[PDB]
Design a protein around this ligand. Sequence first.
Ligand SMILES: [Br-]
Ligand SMILES: [Br-]
Ligand SMILES: [Mg+2]
Ligand SMILES: [Mg+2]
Length: 320
Amino acid sequence: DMSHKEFTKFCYEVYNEIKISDKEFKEKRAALDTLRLCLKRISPDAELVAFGSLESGLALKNSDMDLCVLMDTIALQFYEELIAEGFEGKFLQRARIPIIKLTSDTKNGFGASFQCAIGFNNRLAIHNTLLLSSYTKLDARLKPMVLLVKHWAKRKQINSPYFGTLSSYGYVLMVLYYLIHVIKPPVFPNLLLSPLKQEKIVDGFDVGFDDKLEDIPPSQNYSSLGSLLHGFFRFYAYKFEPREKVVTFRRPDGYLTKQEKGWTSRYILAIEDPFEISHNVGRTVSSSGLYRIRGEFMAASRLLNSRSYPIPYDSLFEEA
Ligand SMILES: [Br-]
Ligand SMILES: [Br-]
Ligand SMILES: [Mg+2]
Ligand SMILES: [Mg+2]
């Protein structure tokens, strides 16, 4: 595939600038080690598990850590020890879903800008990280594609779940959906729908998937990174119908209506979590938020569709 050679070269240049460094990666590893030791002072029966982009390898520079304490009230004891240990942070006891947010470190050398969120017994988040991790190990093109889409969403201000747009995880799912169920030949098989997948029930949901990666043959898609991204932008700009359809990993042909799903009355953008199927990852998206997201997909597509010469690829990541 030599169709997008220039754009591809540019994609890999930006990727190398935005990906987390091995140094920052090692630092967050040491932070995790330190926090684990702190938790073991509270209880021998609790474990501290990393999830999210640092664990899957899909992290941008300066990303926050996402951690989960697994057990079986420890939250408050852990919080008190962490601050006694010189971390600074926030915690709301008895909260619906307790969360410790660490915002700084004063004694442990992890920096004044050390950011870490610690949840409790969130086994589902751990399993979707396992799934994302497997896909990143399956195809070398996935990691840069995800980072570039995340970087784009951030720069275009459409990566703000608290402000009516979409979480980073939401964009990752939109990427996987495209690579599995839209692009032909597929970049990836659907690991949940594999005939080798076995059911595994956690928290009332099936988190089973075909995880024996060595038995998965290499992709029959030979598209360059640039071609994959252009295709992804065009699908969500022009083809996907968010008023009617659900991004899903539970259908062999990837086809699912909001009607059938019963997601009709927030469901402005519908993205069904692959394990917690009752959760719409896009429920933070407002009507105005979706209009801006769609607008940005069209602009990205328009830029890349250009038959003119030298294309200003930089504008893809220029702010606003
Ligand atoms: Br993610
Ligand atoms: Br199209
Ligand atoms: Mg290449
Ligand atoms: Mg643009």
